């Protein structure tokens with residue numbers, strides 16, 4: 001987002017570093033992270049729209065930036081569940097709950113997307129996650145026989161389709177601002193991949 005704004009409340013949690021719902025592991029233990037309420041997570045009617053986004057969060061004591069790694073199931077609109085190293089920067093740990101303002105911001109990252117091909121993926125069914133993206137990824141499409149096919153983003157932060165075809169995949173990704181970039185991902189196997197793997201991408205959303 002270039003500009004954005006939300007109000008709500010934050011609490012804190014030790015979860016989300018490992019086994020978070022968005023399958024973004026490994027998460028370095030000293031990263032500042034957050035779980036996010038389902039209503040804001042599924043922005044624009046896209047499941048996990050905000051997975052792997054970064055938020056700037058302002059509390060009573062200051063501002064800080066967090067990586068969104070997990071779902072906050074019991075969260076109301078605007079609600080966030082921060083890691084302790086983030087919460088203590090913007091509020092007092094003696095509080096179980098604080099008022100916050102927050103917004104989607106550009107990821108503090110460098111380089112291009114990487115893609116994660118989920119175990120079980122094949123030409124018949126594949127789940128493809130985008131990582132290292134500067135803004136939330138709202139949409140992913142691949143080209144098959146001259147037409148662009150929309151992939152459904154899943155709760156587990158991968159985009160899914162079926163009968164994708166043989167050969168390398170031409171893909172296009174759309175961010176929360178409507179910016180579109182295109183890339184190529186190496187071919188999917190004929191049989192389901194026994195293990196998940198990552199592939200370096202060659203494109204990034206614009207600044």
Ligand SMILES: OC[C@H]1O[C@@H](O[C@H]2[C@H](O)[C@@H](O)[C@H](O[C@H]3[C@H](O)[C@@H](O)[C@H](O[C@H]4[C@H](O)[C@@H](O)[C@H](O[C@H]5[C@H](O)[C@@H](O)[C@H](O[C@H]6[C@H](O)[C@@H](O)[C@H](O)O[C@@H]6CO)O[C@@H]5CO)O[C@@H]4CO)O[C@@H]3CO)O[C@@H]2CO)[C@H](O)[C@@H](O)[C@@H]1O
Nearest residue numbers: 021023118119120121122124125126127156162190191192
């Ligand atoms: O030779 C005879 C004829 O064959 C035809 O071709 C057939 C072919 O024979 C057949 O093998 C093939 O079967 C494939 C299916 O088409 C395809 O749908 C299927 O996809 C499965 C996949 O195997 C499986 O791994 C995957 O599991 C996902 C799951 O969906 C997902 O929900 C779950 O996510 C969870 C996370 O793992 C978890 O961490 C998180 O917390 O929760 C998540 C959500 O709950 O993840 C798992 C694992 O990744 O599901 C998909 C989809 O259901 O794969 C089959 C085997 O490859 O079909 C072909 C076409 O029908 C020819 O057409 C004909 O000519 C021949 O004569």
